[PDB]
Design a binder for this molecule. Structure first.
Ligand SMILES: *[C@@H](C)[C@H]1/C(=C/c2[nH]c(/C=C3N=C(/C=C4\NC(=O)C(CC)=C4C)C(C)=C\3CCC(=O)O)c(CCC(=O)O)c2C)NC(=O)[C@@H]1C
Ligand SMILES: *[C@H](C)[C@H]1/C(=C/c2[nH]c(/C=C3N=C(/C=C4\NC(=O)C(CC)=C4C)C(C)=C\3CCC(=O)O)c(CCC(=O)O)c2C)NC(=O)[C@@H]1C
Ligand SMILES: *[C@H](C)[C@H]1/C(=C/c2[nH]c(/C=C3N=C(/C=C4\NC(=O)C(CC)=C4C)C(C)=C\3CCC(=O)O)c(CCC(=O)O)c2C)NC(=O)[C@@H]1C
Ligand SMILES: *[C@H](C)[C@H]1/C(=C/c2[nH]c(/C=C3N=C(/C=C4\NC(=O)C(CC)=C4C)C(C)=C\3CCC(=O)O)c(CCC(=O)O)c2C)NC(=O)[C@@H]1C
Ligand SMILES: *[C@H](C)[C@H]1/C(=C/c2[nH]c(/C=C3N=C(/C=C4\NC(=O)C(CC)=C4C)C(C)=C\3CCC(=O)O)c(CCC(=O)O)c2C)NC(=O)[C@@H]1C
Ligand SMILES: *[C@H](C)[C@H]1/C(=C/c2[nH]c(/C=C3N=C(/C=C4\NC(=O)C(CC)=C4C)C(C)=C\3CCC(=O)O)c(CCC(=O)O)c2C)NC(=O)[C@@H]1C
Ligand SMILES: *[C@H](C)[C@H]1/C(=C/c2[nH]c(/C=C3N=C(/C=C4\NC(=O)C(CC)=C4C)C(C)=C\3CCC(=O)O)c(CCC(=O)O)c2C)NC(=O)[C@@H]1C
Lengths: 169, 161, 169, 160, 160, 67, 49, 161, 160, 161, 160, 160
């Protein structure tokens, strides 16, 4: 549908091993698309396609990958074509896949050493996209009673490892 | 914070009466609009980086604030500003899904204007970025959802100004 | 954290001795080797991304099951985590090359490495193979460049493989 | 600068600066003449450096000039040259300060999400900064090139 | 309010709404018509709930209407059945909102120290909402009264 | 226990690197006297600005009866 | 080798998120039962399954 | 903070240009002075307790502020006052090594005046105490660095007054 | 050491070593020969420095060695000279290491609490270290005397 | 905080004088009234919840504040109000045991007026509630202990007003 | 005071005073007549106690009035006696208040920094207030000396 | 006890106990015979107080023994009188301890959740302890009645 600037790739010039890598990458893209369809959350696609452009662009054509997943979306849509209530899920998951795959690699999260004794660290921005994020509780002054009591109970759970005002008042 | 439903519950509760006809058919209007609100939230959640991208593209780039002497010049300042605009899109999405504007002065408009004055952040160019984020969202999702998105973005710019 | 000077000072402090001619000779040897250590560290400062990329591009061909399914470097999240680990190893190898002592490697790399890798299922053999691949690349680049002293480059990587590696015999 | 470094470390440790740090300050204050010489020759001859730097960059990566890139227009070409000149300017600033701190606080922190927002490829720009380093290394004298190389190397490290 | 808890949980997790949560908002919006149907049936039959719960309470537990209790004469019972109307209004609020969040907002918490300061038996208030529950289940269709009892039993569990 | 009513804005210097959630850097705080010196030093070393501070708690110049 | 061991307990990093994992984790971290929102997510996902 | 060497760098960052000769000569002057600045900082670091002791001895000793009824009478007040003087000397050492008063403007002059007004701290007593700091430092090092110390101490005088 | 401080400062912010840290380590390496010469003449004259400085200390402060004093007696006098030799050895360690952290880690943490438990006047110990500074500074060239007196004055500042 | 003996000890310490008869008369008065204060505090702690419930029955119940739309309508709001009332009772007991109202005008009245003005709490109605508490305590513990309670309670009223 | 520390514990645990601490305040009130009697006899003998204790201090430690001591001269000895008068006033203040809290919050914490900046020997002023407690225990009755000696020994412990 | 409270507070502040707590401890030690006498009086009358107060509760509030009540049943009333014996035992513990900490640590933490589960009315439990207070105060001497009723009203205040 939208080929930006791609050129088709010759098999003999591309080499056998790179062609096998391309074929298993295409089948793996379709496999994880089906797995995300089953899971109901595109988080697997987001994590495993967010940083893929920089590593894949060194020896593989990024426009060819874009046209490849474009043809995958079109072929899956026309071969499925059941109804609008079940086709827009596949369409939006392939759109999420192409947007995350065209998105370049974000900055790795850097854990600064708080002092001289403690080593500073780095963490890629794909590990902190699937690993069950902590719910952050911030006490804004205007908050209503329900979320204020939620923040107070979360603070009690943090300090005392449990909800003591529920367990023992 | 509250919603359309929580707002009508409170606005009935302050006289302590049950649900009247006006509450009933405005909740009918809310439930009629709700699927459109979820579709708009879904499409801007899917495209959410690109809306901020086009907003900073036709708002703040090639400008005197991006030139040295401005507050967009340094790259840490640029990253902080685009992170702020992404947070504004996320909180405007929250307001649009919730149906009420209380989440803005609940969460973002607590102290934003005066801490921006403390940091020397240009309020006028920030309001221009809000107008840009308005028109890019209205171009993406259409006029019908874009107008009610622009209601809470007008709330953002009026609270910040 | 101790360098060669710090560990010599600690060794003499333990016995309560003033620094004799042998200690002066050790410090003298460290001070004349320090220019070559600085040159090697400034060399690996420039090329470090290329070193870790080609180290992955050699390690995943020596052991190709790491990028097949059920391998631990399968997904691109695990791939980026493995490359971040290789960047960690090269950074602390640069630190040990500057310090001329492996106490920095012991304190900040090796003391929980088997624990973390056994907790997350991360292999140790392919990891130390990647360490030795990085060592061979840095040794070859130092031999290619104008480095008069190249003997000290292999020492932190060999220490890391000896400390981390399971005792075969 | 390294003066900012020793004041920050001393204030973090709640003490006055100590002897090795003071001797390092004396060494930096001694070498400041070489730093000002490198900065002034880079400032006076920046234009040839960016000239064959962009020539080598767009010879190596013929996709931004090509369709499907980000440097079609002359305005984007001039902004890429402006980025090149700003990076050389920050290199001169950091050579003057003696450490990485000007380059960090003005052009390196958040630069990867900065160009994530602008769709400029970060490995493409580290290729740009390497060929800029090659041009500056060729233009400067040998001890000056050895002095100014690790700043470019640090830019390579932090960008990618 | 399901959308209130959606915004609160999505802000705590610090990301946009997941597609499963969006499908939840679809389900809540589609069930909004049924829950407002239950709401207007309850506010149509509000007064018979109040009267039948009141006199069934006075026949099952006559201690409070007796001397020694809190219900003396007419005005104490008038304030009590006003409280019954208040709790029925809160049940209708929870039904029309789809969650017990506005019940906790106006009244579901603080009721124990409320009735301890007032001398009112909290378990008798819980039993009061109990015959509210099965009188509503008697008058309104039980398969569709499962939704209303799903908030009624939470109310009696909080006041138990 | 004598305390202070302070009001300050402390921007995070590492939020760009760490990619964490945002907080309102402006706040009105009640801080005790014994902790206020360390808290003020933390604010000024983090780079924030204390824009208001008053002795709202206790009388100024009390020699005895402090805590 | 290393002269001490801190212990190696089993680490279970969540490789990807699903709707039931997200809903049950959201209830579990907030220390609550599955209330109406979490049951509605589960109901919609189980009907669409 | 920012040094004297980074001051011209920040000014050129605002101007969007390289270093010009009107800043090159100032940078060369800082390079010419920096060894005597860092050595005088080393000397007052070695003798740092003596400056505080002599300043207390010849300014605040046997006065209304330290007799009963004064704001520096009690032992806690004396310990807090000598701690404040030690911090003043350390940050003045930091500035005279650094070539700029930005460290005092940010890490001392943030709200110190308002805290002193809150505590009832005598501003004139602190001003004559830092005059005593000036006299002891000028006697210890000599007037060549004494006037350079007195520049930043007069900056302290203008900020606190 | 200076190498340790530079590696720690790089590792705390999780990067490779900066060009400023490379220049500092290069200055440390180039000054290593002079520092080794200073440490060599200190450890060669370690007996006469302790002897002359102890003599000057006991002439200037007879109260610590008079009866009723902390060091009265030949055994306590020998213990005081042993402490002076210990601090001279730590000064040589600091001279070798190029900074003050071996002296800090060995003999300057808890020194006030230790000598308070011992009953020894810490200002008189500081006077002993000052006499060691004067005697050692009389035995070298001017730059070497200043460089060693930097570490000596660090010990003076930590004791008083 | 500052009780009677620390208050007279601070008044002596400001002038730098030993305790004389001009403060020891008040000290003997405090030690003469001490067991009266302790027994009154014991009675108030015995009947602490009953004082609050009779006070809200005689001053706050069946009013526009507990009508819907009032300032005591919702259950959390009523719980907060009775929490404030027995806070005032317990801190008045603290000041009554201390002999001075430093605890009352400091750890209760630090920002209580400002937070009640921001919330919208009726200051006059809270004053009427405190007067009801004072009447109940005066009728429950006696005349002299009742007026000793009333001094601190209308001190609370003057702090609120 | 002990009453304000009791109410500090009470509102730290966020409830009314315990009956045990109420009876404890009763015991403090009943003993306060005896503490005030100790206050009368101490403020009557406020001159002779401090004069005899100062004479004993100069007799024990002649190095204070000898050259090399801090208190050399008539104004220096007058200020030393003034410090002893202030500390005697603080001990009487503590006997009145029933706890060591007024001594702590007036002139007992920070005394290390006080006499470090003054150069005054902390063991010598501890010996001086020890002679104050010996002359005070000589002049008091047995129960009054036993009551005051605990507060005096707390001054000894925190000022040693 | 107050010994446990003072030792715990001094441990948390990492300090020895001051004489301002030591005099409180020795006053509690000396004034122990009255609390001991009240303790043997209460454990001598441990049965009859429980019998009379249970009789008074079930005659004042017959809703407890009403059908559908919490204590409907002979074994339920037996466990109710056993709970009265439990709280009388805790009152004797607090009397002989001179502190409220045994009652707090044994039978006051989690009582609200416990009886919220079991359905037993917490205000009727408070009425039971109040009736035990009235029976004990009628049984014993007036000052001892006030001393025991102090802990009794602490228990009923923590109940409600
Ligand atoms: C009758 C079967 C039961 C009962 C009730 C009873 N309640 C009161 C008095 C009050 N109850 C409230 C509670 C609320 N007001 C609100 O607005 C809300 C939330 C919507 C609640 C929960 C209040 C405030 C009062 C005080 C009266 C007033 O509204 O101003 C009484 C009267 C007691 C009296 O002393 O006057 C009675 C009798 N008592 C029972 O025993 C039954 C369980
Ligand atoms: C070019 C048109 C095609 C192509 C070829 C190609 N692949 C690799 C190697 C890798 N491919 C991946 C991809 C994935 N990671 C995931 O988690 C998923 C599912 C979402 C995919 C599809 C990765 C991580 C690698 C690196 C591991 C390895 O070495 O095999 C290469 C080699 C790169 C190099 O040598 O530098 C090439 C040339 N990839 C495509 O997508 C096109 C189909
Ligand atoms: C040139 C090497 C590459 C590239 C360039 C390119 N840059 C822009 C736009 C901008 N560049 C900057 C740069 C900086 N901000 C800083 O703080 C610093 C350090 C001091 C620098 C170097 C900024 C702020 C912009 C945005 C402002 C503007 O666009 O006027 C563009 C334009 C993006 C667009 O699509 O419009 C381009 C193309 N592109 C390449 O291909 C080279 C690898
Ligand atoms: C962008 C439209 C323009 C602008 C922005 C800008 N802001 C900052 C600094 C900060 N902004 C925030 C924002 C928030 N605080 C909150 O509580 C919330 C809601 C959750 C938000 C969105 C914060 C916290 C900062 C401090 C930095 C941090 O990350 O902690 C800057 C940087 C100023 C500087 O010099 O550092 C900028 C540039 N200014 C412009 O010019 C853009 C047009
Ligand atoms: C001494 C020259 C005069 C003076 C001093 C004095 N200061 C205090 C107490 C405080 N001063 C500060 C201010 C600072 N905060 C910082 O971070 C810094 C360093 C940049 C300073 C200087 C603060 C916070 C305090 C409170 C101490 C704490 O928070 O722990 C006092 C004590 C006041 C009192 O006891 O009430 C005094 C006496 N006042 C004089 O009269 C001397 C002339
Ligand atoms: C009751 C007498 C009247 C009433 C008041 C009212 N109070 C609140 C809630 C609050 N009460 C306080 C008071 C204190 N908190 C403390 O820690 C102390 C010191 C011991 C005091 C005195 C505060 C700060 C609040 C604010 C929120 C909170 O719950 O903490 C409210 C609720 C306001 C709201 O709805 O957000 C009200 C209405 N109103 C009346 O009509 C009674 C006469
Ligand atoms: C006497 C027992 C020993 C001693 C005394 C001595 N004192 C001073 C002068 C001062 N002492 C203080 C200390 C305090 N002032 C207070 O208000 C309090 C709390 C009640 C204390 C602890 C102060 C502040 C001074 C300075 C006088 C002033 O207020 O300005 C000196 C003089 C110090 C000097 O160098 O001139 C001396 C010598 N010294 C001894 O040897 C005796 C053992």
């Amino acid at each position: 549908p939208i080929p930006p600037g791609f050129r088709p790739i010759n098999i003999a010039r591309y080499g056998p091993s790179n062609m096998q890598k391309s074929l298993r990458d295409m089948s793996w893209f379709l496999r994880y698309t089906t797995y995300a369809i089953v899971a109901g959350d595109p988080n697997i696609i987001v994590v495993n396609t967010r940083g893929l452009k920089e590593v894949i662009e060194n020896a593989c054509s990024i426009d060819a990958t874009i046209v490849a997943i474009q043809e995958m979306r079109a072929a899956s849509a026309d071969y499925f074509r059941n109804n609008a209530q079940a086709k827009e899920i596949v369409l939006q998951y392939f759109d999420i896949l192409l947007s995350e795959f065209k998105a370049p690699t974000p900055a790795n999260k850097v854990r600064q050493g708080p002092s001289n004794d403690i080593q500073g660290l780095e963490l890629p921005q794909s590990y902190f996209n699937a690993a069950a994020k902590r719910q952050k509780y911030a006490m804004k002054p205007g908050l209503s009673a329900l979320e204020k009591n939620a923040v107070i109970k979360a603070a009690y759970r943090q300090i005392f490892e449990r909800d003591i005002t529920k367990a023992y008042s | 914070m509250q919603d359309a439903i929580t707002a009508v519950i409170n606005s009935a509760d302050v006289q302590g009466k049950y649900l009247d006809g006006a509450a009933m058919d405005k909740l009918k209007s809310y439930f009629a609009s709700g699927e459109l609100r979820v579709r708009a939230a879904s499409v801007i959640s899917a495209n959410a980086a690109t809306i901020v991208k086009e907003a900073v593209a036709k708002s703040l780039l090639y400008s005197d604030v991006t030139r040295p002497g401005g507050n967009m010049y340094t790259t840490r300042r640029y990253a902080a500003c685009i992170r702020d605009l992404d947070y504004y899109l996320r909180y405007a999405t929250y307001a649009m899904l919730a149906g009420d504007a209380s989440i803005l002065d609940e969460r973002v408009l607590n102290g934003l204007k005066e801490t921006y004055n403390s940091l020397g952040v240009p309020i006028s160019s920030t309001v221009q970025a809000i107008q840009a984020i308005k028109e890019v969202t209205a171009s993406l999702v259409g006029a019908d959802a874009g107008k009610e998105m622009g209601v809470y973005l007008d709330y953002i710019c009026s609270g910040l100004s | 954290m101790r360098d060669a000077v710090t560990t010599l000072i600690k060794n003499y402090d333990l016995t309560g001795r003033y620094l004799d001619r042998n200690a002066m000779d050790e410090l003298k040897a460290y001070f004349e080797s320090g220019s070559a250590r600085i040159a090697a560290a400034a060399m690996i400062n420039a090329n470090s991304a290329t070193i870790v990329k080609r180290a992955a591009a050699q390690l995943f061909e020596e052991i190709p099951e790491l990028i097949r399914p059920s391998g631990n470097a399968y997904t691109t999240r695990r791939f980026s985590a493995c490359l971040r680990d290789m960047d960690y190893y090269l950074r602390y190898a640069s630190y040990a090359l500057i310090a001329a002592d492996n106490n920095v490697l012991d304190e900040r790399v090796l003391q929980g490495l088997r624990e973390t890798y056994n907790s997350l299922g991360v292999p140790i053999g392919p990891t130390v193979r990647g360490i030795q691949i990085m060592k061979e690349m840095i040794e070859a680049m130092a031999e290619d460049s104008s480095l008069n002293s190249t003997d000290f480059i292999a020492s932190p990587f060999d220490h890391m493989t000896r400390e981390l590696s399971e005792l075969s015999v | 600068s390294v003066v900012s470094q020793v004041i920050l470390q001393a204030d973090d440790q709640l003490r006055y600066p100590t002897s090795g740090e003071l001797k390092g300050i004396q060494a930096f204050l001694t070498t400041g003449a070489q730093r000002i010489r490198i900065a002034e020759t880079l400032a006076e001859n920046e234009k040839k450096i960016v000239d064959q730097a962009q020539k080598q960059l767009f010879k190596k990566h013929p996709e931004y000039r090509a369709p499907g890139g980000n440097a079609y227009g002359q305005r984007q070409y001039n902004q890429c040259l402006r980025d090149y000149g700003w990076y050389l300017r920050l290199v001169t600033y950091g050579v003057l300060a003696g450490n990485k701190e000007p380059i960090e606080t003005t052009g390196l922190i958040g630069v990867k999400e900065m160009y994530n927002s602008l769709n400029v490829p970060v490995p493409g720009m580290v290729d740009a900064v390497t060929v800029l380093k090659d041009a500056a290394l060729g233009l400067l004298s040998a001890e000056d090139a050895n002095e100014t190389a690790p700043y470019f190397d640090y830019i390579i490290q932090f960008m990618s | 309010s399901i959308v209130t808890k959606s915004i609160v949980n999505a802000d705590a997790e610090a990301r946009y709404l997941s597609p499963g949560e969006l499908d939840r908002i679809k389900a809540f919006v589609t069930g909004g018509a049924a829950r407002l149907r239950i709401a207007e049936t309850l506010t149509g039959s509000r007064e018979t709930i109040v009267k039948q719960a009141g006199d069934r309470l006075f026949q099952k537990r006559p201690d409070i209407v007796s001397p020694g209790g809190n219900a003396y004469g007419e005005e104490m019972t008038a304030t009590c059945l006003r409280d019954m109307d208040y709790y029925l209004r809160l049940v209708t609020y929870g039904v029309v909102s789809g969650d017990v969040t506005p019940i906790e907002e106006i009244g579901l918490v603080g009721v124990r120290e409320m009735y301890r300061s007032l001398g009112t038996p909290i378990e008798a208030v819980a039993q009061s909402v109990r015959e509210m529950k099965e009188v509503a289940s008697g008058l309104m269709s039980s398969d569709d009264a499962a939704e209303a009892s799903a908030y009624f039993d939470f109310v009696i569990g909080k006041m138990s | 226990m004598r305390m202070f009513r302070i009001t300050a804005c402390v921007p995070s210097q590492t939020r760009i690197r760490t990619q964490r959630e945002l907080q309102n850097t402006y706040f009105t705080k009640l801080v005790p006297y014994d902790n206020w010196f360390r808290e003020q030093q933390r604010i000024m070393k983090m780079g924030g600005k204390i824009v208001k501070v008053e002795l709202a708690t206790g009388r100024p110049g009390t020699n005895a009866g402090l805590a | 080798s290393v002269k001490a061991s801190g212990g190696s307990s089993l680490a279970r990093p969540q490789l990807y998120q699903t709707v039931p994992v997200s809903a049950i984790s959201q209830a579990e971290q907030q220390d609550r039962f599955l209330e109406g929102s979490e049951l509605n997510e589960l109901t919609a996902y189980f009907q669409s399954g």
